[PDB]
C-alpha cells in the first residue's frame, strides 16, 4: 500500500506533540480515533494519527478547541521516542538517489512534496507556541523535554533539489502521472467519446495546492 512506502514513513516519522508541549494546552489540529477509544476529549495529534493510528478509524475534529495529545494514556505510543536525525537524513538521501519511490503518491493521493509542504506550513503555524524549558506525582508521564521536530524543512529542501521528484510534482495529473484518488485515473470502462473528453485535460489541483502552500502558507522562510 502507498502509505507503507519507506520514503513516506521516513518523512512522517516525526515525534509526538506531547513531547514538547508538555501537559499544558496548546492550539493544534486534533484527530480522534474510534478504534483506540479516543473521543469526547482524550485526543491525539497529527503525528500520532499518521503513525500510531495508521489504518484505524482516525479522522480530524472540525470543531477543535485547544488541546494536548494523550495517546500515551490510552494506547501504546510509537511517537514518544525519536531516532537518530543524521541517520534519518542519510536514509532520505539514499532513498532519493537509489529508488524512484518519490514519484508514487500516498493513500490520500498527495505526492511526497505536497505532504512535506503541508507539514512545513502546519509546523510553522504550531511550533511558534512552543514555550522553551523555563527554569523557575505522575511517574508514568512520557518524557516532555525534547525540541519540536525539525526534519520536515530539511526533507523539503533536499527533495526539491532532486530533479525527478520536482518533475513528478509539477507534472502530476498529466498523461503519465495520475493519482488514485482522481476521477480521471480509471476511465477505461467508459465510452470512447467520454474517454477522449477526459483524456484531453490534465490535472492541476495538486500543483495548485503545492504552489499555494509554498507561497502563501510557508511564510516563515524564503529558502
Which residues define the annotated binding site?
16, 33, 36, 45, 48, 52-53, 56, 69, 71, 77
- Residue 16 near residue 49 (C-beta atoms within 8 A): no
**Which is nearer to other proteins, 87 or 183 (by Cβ)?**
183
Burial code of 158-173, b = ≥16 C-beta within 10 A, e = fewer? ebbebeebeebbbebb
Tell the smallest beta-carbon distance from residue 111 to Zn ion (Å).
25
**Which is nearer to Zn ion, 125 or 171 (by Cβ)?**
125
Report if residue 191 touches other proteins, rule: CB under 8 A. yes
Give the total of residues touching other proteins (CB under 8 A). Answer: 21
Burial code of 60-78, b = ≥16 C-beta within 10 A, e = fewer? eeeeeeebbbbbbeebebe
**Which is nearer to other proteins, 136 or 189 (by Cβ)?**
189
> Of 40, 137, 138, 193, which one interacts with other proteins (CB under 8 A)?
193
Tell the smallest beta-carbon distance from residue 114 to other proteins (Å).
15
Among 149, 197, 154, 199, residue whose Cα is nearest residue 174: 199
List the x/- string, 5-34, binding to Zn ion by CB under 5 A: -----------xx---------------x-
Binding residues for Zn(2+): 16, 33, 36, 45, 48, 52-53, 56, 69, 71, 77
**Which is nearer to other proteins, 76 or 189 (by Cβ)?**
189
Tell the smallest beta-carbon distance from residue 54 to other proteins (Å).
24
Report if residue 200 touches other proteins, rule: CB under 8 A. yes
Tell the smallest beta-carbon distance from residue 216 to other proteins (Å).
14
Sequence-distant (≥ 6) Cβ neighbours of residue 130 within 8 angstroms:
20, 21, 148
Judged by the rule CB under 8 A, the positions of this chain that interact with other proteins are 173, 182-184, 186-187, 190-194, 196-198, 200-205, 208
Judged by the rule CB under 5 A, the positions of this chain that interact with Zn ion are 16-17, 33, 35-36, 44-45, 48, 52-53, 56, 69, 71, 77, 79
Amino acid at each position: 500500500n502507498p502509505d507503507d512506502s519507506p520514503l513516506y514513513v521516513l518523512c512522517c516519522n516525526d515525534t509526538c506533540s506531547f513531547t514538547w508541549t508538555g501537559a499544558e494546552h496548546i492550539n493544534q489540529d486534533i484527530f480522534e480515533c474510534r478504534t483506540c477509544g479516543l473521543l469526547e476529549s482524550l485526543c491525539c495529534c497529527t503525528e500520532c494519527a499518521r503513525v500510531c493510528h495508521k489504518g484505524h478509524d482516525c479522522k480530524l475534529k472540525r470543531t477543535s478547541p485547544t488541546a494536548y495529545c494523550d495517546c500515551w494514556e490510552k494506547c501504546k505510543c510509537k511517537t514518544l521516542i525519536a531516532g537518530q536525525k543524521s541517520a534519518r537524513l542519510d536514509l532520505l538521501y539514499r532513498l532519493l538517489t537509489a529508488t524512484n519511490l518519490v514519484t508514487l503518491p500516498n493513500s490520500r493521493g498527495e505526492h511526497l512534496l505536497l505532504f512535506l509542504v503541508q507539514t512545513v506550513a502546519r509546523q510553522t503555524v504550531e511550533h511558534c507556541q512552543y514555550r522553551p524549558p523555563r527554569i523557575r506525582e505522575d511517574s508514568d508521564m512520557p518524557d516532555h523535554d525534547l525540541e519540536p521536530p525539525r526534519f520536515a524543512q530539511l526533507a523539503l529542501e533536499r527533495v526539491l533539489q532532486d530533479w525527478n521528484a520536482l518533475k513528478s510534482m509539477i507534472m502530476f495529473g498529466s498523461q503519465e502521472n495520475k493519482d488514485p484518488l482522481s476521477a480521471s485515473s480509471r476511465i477505461g470502462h467508459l465510452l470512447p467519446e467520454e474517454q477522449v473528453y477526459l483524456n484531453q485535460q490534465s490535472g492541476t489541483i495538486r500543483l495548485d495546492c503545492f504552489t499555494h502552500c509554498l507561497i502563501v502558507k510557508c511564510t516563515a522562510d524564503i529558502l
